[PDB]
RNA sequence: AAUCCGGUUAAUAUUCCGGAACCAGAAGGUGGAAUCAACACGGCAACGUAAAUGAAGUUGGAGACGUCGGCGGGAGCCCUGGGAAGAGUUCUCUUUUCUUUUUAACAAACCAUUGAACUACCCUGAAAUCGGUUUAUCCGGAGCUAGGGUAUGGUGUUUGGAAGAGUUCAGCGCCUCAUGCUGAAUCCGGUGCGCUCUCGACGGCCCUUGAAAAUCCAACGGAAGAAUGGCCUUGUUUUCACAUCUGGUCGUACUCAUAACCGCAGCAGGUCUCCAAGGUGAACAGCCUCUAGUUGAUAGAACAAUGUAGAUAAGGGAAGUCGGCAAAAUGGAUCCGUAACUUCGGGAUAAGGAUUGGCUCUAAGGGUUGGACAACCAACUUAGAACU
């Protein structure tokens, strides 16, 4: 059963706080409570702890990543990484 | 309290200087408990055979103080 | 049934007021104050508990013999076997990389 | 598998207060095996009288407490209570005293 | 509260000693009019205030 | 850093007595090991041992940590089937009803057996027709399933402590005295969405991520050490075992409250917290009961008016009153059914209907089991039928 037409994870909030605010929170929490792939282990086991820290379990690669508030990587950081990569190559060459 | 199961070890610990008193306890199940009061621990040996108990008593150091409770 | 009281003047359910019910050889149900559970030492590189070491309070380790507080291996009782093996391999490989770097420089 | 429960009433038999003859029939008609009280067939509890010691022989691991309970039932039926009391002396042996 | 300091216990001892009935001979002393005393303190009437 | 049991006073008990332990500090009698030369061995590994040299310096760990929810294990309690001892009831019946049937700290050996991880790690091996697996969806070519091991180990098991204690019952001294003596039993089983505490593996939540220090342990590292006429003799081993001495000072009575605190008081007020039996019942609800406690709230006589508190009342049903104030009415559970509106989540227990006792049965849903069968034991539910 679908159990929810559109609210989804925000069904715990009942009818309060407003529809637009609930929708924005729904998108954020969907991003927040998502398993991501470790860029060093290749396993979909990365989970968030305390708004900016992402860890994946297992026997190996117990690394702790510094990421975004609810996503492992943000668009601005990716753009900055590309810009810094470009600048470093120009300086080296 | 510590329990011993070796007859010769009990005899050695009885011949040891710190061994002062020995107690004989007879139970209703035909078992005899030999309890040695050392400085730190009370050592208990359980014997099920009266024939072996008699020889154990004979081989015990006569200079040791042994009482029956 | 029988009801129990604290045997000390601490009247609150604190972490230092842990109690266990015992039945004495007088048909008496009463409390017995006990200490907190011990902790197994953790690995310094991965944080995993160390195998072969008992869980005790920090002061209780002073009464144990030396071999009960460690493992017969390099970094025994401070690092796990996997951590020690990784350090050995990493050390050897990097020293080899230094040697080949010097040789290629010359 | 056999038991030899004994009840002694020498305190009242020699005093001519106890009726072992009626005690025989009381036990026979009130001993219950498998629910009903008429399951006596000589392969089960048997009763025997010696004019001073009533004997109950059993083969189905009988209980002496039930025997004492029936003795108290007979005591109250004959109104001999407050003068005679059943006590236990040996294993499976009960006796009546005056107290 | 059964958990008292040494100073508190000594003060309680002093208060207890300064609560006994007055011997009559001192009151009968010539030129001494001690007689009755209102200094007597009851635990349920006047508190010591530490 | 380290204590338990039993007993004892008129009043103190983890403090006294009896028994049995533990910790810290100080000094230092053995002893095995190894050395005719250096500071032990075993396991393919996880790792293990009776010791198995270790100065600084450095590093790591313990101390040391939130909250909620479900699951599994243990201890105590609750419940239950027998046996034993005593007591209650007995017009009648009740192999009946009630009380007891106990094993502390500490020490040793096992510990998934007997109950409970595949919990962590290691070895063989290489897996798609992918497999394993929890109540709950996680794991695996960064090495699955499977087989075999290693560690974590008590509130688990067998013992010592320890029956000599305690409990129950039954006799003899009978002025009995230091209260003495002589007898027995204290046994065998089971159960669970049960209660309290605790432990283990998990899951969820945070723009909330949930102290510090004293103190203890471990590691890297190598400072320092001196036996030799193949045999007496010393340095380590007192992080092995055993043995000796010491552990000072302060508090410890009692109330903790409808009489020991505060409120002017022996004031219906206020004041933090621990343990929590049985039945009915979802339940720590209400009601009755067991252990324990109390029967303490100036008393006697009679029911006048008006009061305070609790109830009822024919017919009408808010006509009362500013106002349905107050009271009444509804109420648990199961089965049908549930509108407008809406932020789609709700409204909603909407509204509105039916049933509910007792007794005798039937059907289904689960656990070891003798030669696809199957002899019992031990369990709670759900649904239906007849009768009354
Ligand atoms: Zn990873």
Swiss-Prot record, chain A:
Organism: Schizosaccharomyces pombe (strain 972 / ATCC 24843)
Name by which UniProt lists this protein: Large ribosomal subunit protein eL43A
Alphabetized Gene3D superfamilies for the sequence: 2.20.25.30
Similarity field: Belongs to the eukaryotic ribosomal protein eL43 family.
Subunit structure: Component of the large ribosomal subunit (LSU). Mature yeast ribosomes consist of a small (40S) and a large (60S) subunit. The 40S small subunit contains 1 molecule of ribosomal RNA (18S rRNA) and at least 33 different proteins. The large 60S subunit contains 3 rRNA molecules (25S, 5.8S and 5S rRNA) and at least 46 different proteins.
PANTHER family: 60S RIBOSOMAL PROTEIN L37A, LARGE RIBOSOMAL SUBUNIT PROTEIN EL43
Location in the cell: Cytoplasm
Keywords: Cytoplasm, Metal-binding, Ribonucleoprotein, Ribosomal protein, Zinc, Zinc-finger
Swiss-Prot record, chain C:
Location(s), subcellular: Cytoplasm; Nucleus, Nucleolus
This protein's UniProt keywords: Cytoplasm, Nucleus, Phosphoprotein, Ribonucleoprotein, Ribosomal protein
Chain segments annotated as transmembrane: none
GO terms (BP aspect): cytoplasmic translation; ribosome biogenesis
Gene3D superfamilies: 6.20.340.10, 6.20.370.70
Extra remark beyond the main annotation: There are 2 genes for eL34 in S.pombe.
Protein name according to UniProt: Large ribosomal subunit protein eL34B
Curated annotation (Swiss-Prot), chain D:
GO terms (BP aspect): cytoplasmic translation
Phosphoserine found at: 42-43
Keyword S-adenosyl-L-methionine: no
Chief location: cytoplasm
GO molecular function: RNA binding; structural constituent of ribosome
Cellular localisation: Cytoplasm; Nucleus, Nucleolus
Keywords for the protein's UniProt record, in alphabetical order: Cytoplasm, Nucleus, Phosphoprotein, Ribonucleoprotein, Ribosomal protein
Gene Ontology cellular-component terms listed: cytosol; cytosolic large ribosomal subunit; nucleolus; preribosome
Domain of life: Eukaryota
Homology family: Belongs to the eukaryotic ribosomal protein eL22 family.
Subunit and partners: Component of the large ribosomal subunit (LSU). Mature yeast ribosomes consist of a small (40S) and a large (60S) subunit. The 40S small subunit contains 1 molecule of ribosomal RNA (18S rRNA) and at least 33 different proteins. The large 60S subunit contains 3 rRNA molecules (25S, 5.8S and 5S rRNA) and at least 46 different proteins.
Function per UniProt: Component of the ribosome, a large ribonucleoprotein complex responsible for the synthesis of proteins in the cell. The small ribosomal subunit (SSU) binds messenger RNAs (mRNAs) and translates the encoded message by selecting cognate aminoacyl-transfer RNA (tRNA) molecules. The large subunit (LSU) contains the ribosomal catalytic site termed the peptidyl transferase center (PTC), which catalyzes the formation of peptide bonds, thereby polymerizing the amino acids delivered by tRNAs into a polypeptide chain.
Protein name, as recorded: Large ribosomal subunit protein eL22
Part of the full-length chain shown: 8 to 106 of 117
Curated annotation (Swiss-Prot), chain E:
Region: Disordered, residue numbers: 1-20
Biased amino acid composition, Basic residues: 1-14
Gene3D superfamilies in the cross-refs: Ribosomal protein L39e
A GO term, aspect molecular function: structural constituent of ribosome
Annotated signal peptide: none
Main location: cytoplasm
Assembly, per entry: Component of the large ribosomal subunit (LSU). Mature yeast ribosomes consist of a small (40S) and a large (60S) subunit. The 40S small subunit contains 1 molecule of ribosomal RNA (18S rRNA) and at least 33 different proteins. The large 60S subunit contains 3 rRNA molecules (25S, 5.8S and 5S rRNA) and at least 46 different proteins. eL39 interacts with yih1.
Function recorded in the entry: Component of the ribosome, a large ribonucleoprotein complex responsible for the synthesis of proteins in the cell. The small ribosomal subunit (SSU) binds messenger RNAs (mRNAs) and translates the encoded message by selecting cognate aminoacyl-transfer RNA (tRNA) molecules. The large subunit (LSU) contains the ribosomal catalytic site termed the peptidyl transferase center (PTC), which catalyzes the formation of peptide bonds, thereby polymerizing the amino acids delivered by tRNAs into a polypeptide chain.
Protein name per Swiss-Prot or TrEMBL: Large ribosomal subunit protein eL39
Organism for this UniProt entry: Schizosaccharomyces pombe (strain 972 / ATCC 24843) (Fission yeast)
């Amino acid at each position: 059963t679908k159990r929810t037409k559109k609210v989804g994870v925000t069904g715990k909030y009942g009818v309060r706080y407003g529809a637009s605010l609930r929708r924005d929170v729904r998108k954020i929490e969907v991003q927040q409570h998502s398993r991501y792939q470790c860029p060093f282990c290749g396993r979909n086991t990365v989970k968030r702890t305390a708004a900016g820290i992402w860890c994946c379990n297992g026997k190996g690669c117990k690394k702790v990543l510094a990421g975004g508030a609810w996503t492992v990587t943000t668009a601005a950081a990716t753009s900055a990484r590309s810009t810094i990569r470009r600048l470093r190559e120009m300086v080296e060459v | 309290p510590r329990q011993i199961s070796d007859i010769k070890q009990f005899l050695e610990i009885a011949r040891r200087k710190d061994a002062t008193s020995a107690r004989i306890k007879k139970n209703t199940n035909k078992d005899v408990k030999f309890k040695l009061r050392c400085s730190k621990y009370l050592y208990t040996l359980v014997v099920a055979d009266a024939k072996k108990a008699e020889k154990l008593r004979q081989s015990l150091p006569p200079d040791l103080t042994v009482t029956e409770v | 049934a029988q009801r129990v009281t604290y045997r000390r003047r601490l009247a609150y359910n604190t972490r230092s007021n842990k109690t266990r019910i015992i039945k004495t050889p007088g048909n008496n149900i009463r409390y017995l104050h006990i200490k907190k559970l011990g902790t197994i030492p953790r690995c310094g590189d991965t944080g995993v508990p160390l195998q072969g070491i008992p869980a005790l309070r920090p002061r209780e380790f002073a009464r144990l013999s030396h071999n009960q507080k460690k493992v017969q291996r390099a970094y025994g009782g401070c690092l796990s076997a996997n951590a020690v093996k990784d350090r050995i391999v990493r050390a050897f490989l990097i020293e080899e990389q230094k040697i080949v770097k010097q040789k290629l420089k010359q | 598998v056999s038991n030899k429960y004994i009840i002694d009433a020498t305190a009242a038999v020699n005093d001519k207060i106890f009726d072992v003859a009626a005690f025989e029939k009381y036990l026979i008609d009130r001993i219950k095996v498998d629910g009903k009280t008429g399951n006596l067939g000589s392969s089960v509890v048997v009763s025997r009288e010696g004019s001073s010691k009533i004997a109950v022989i059993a083969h189905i691991d009988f209980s002496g407490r039930y025997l004492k309970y029936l003795t108290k039932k007979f005591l109250k039926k004959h109104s001999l209570r407050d003068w005679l009391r059943v006590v236990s002396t040996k294993k499976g042996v009960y006796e009546l005293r005056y107290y | 509260p059964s958990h008292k300091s040494f100073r508190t216990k000594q003060k309680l001892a002093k208060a207890a000693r300064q609560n006994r009935p007055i011997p009559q001979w001192i009151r009968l002393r010539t030129g001494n009019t001690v007689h009755y005393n209102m200094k007597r303190r009851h635990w349920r009437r006047t508190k010591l205030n530490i």
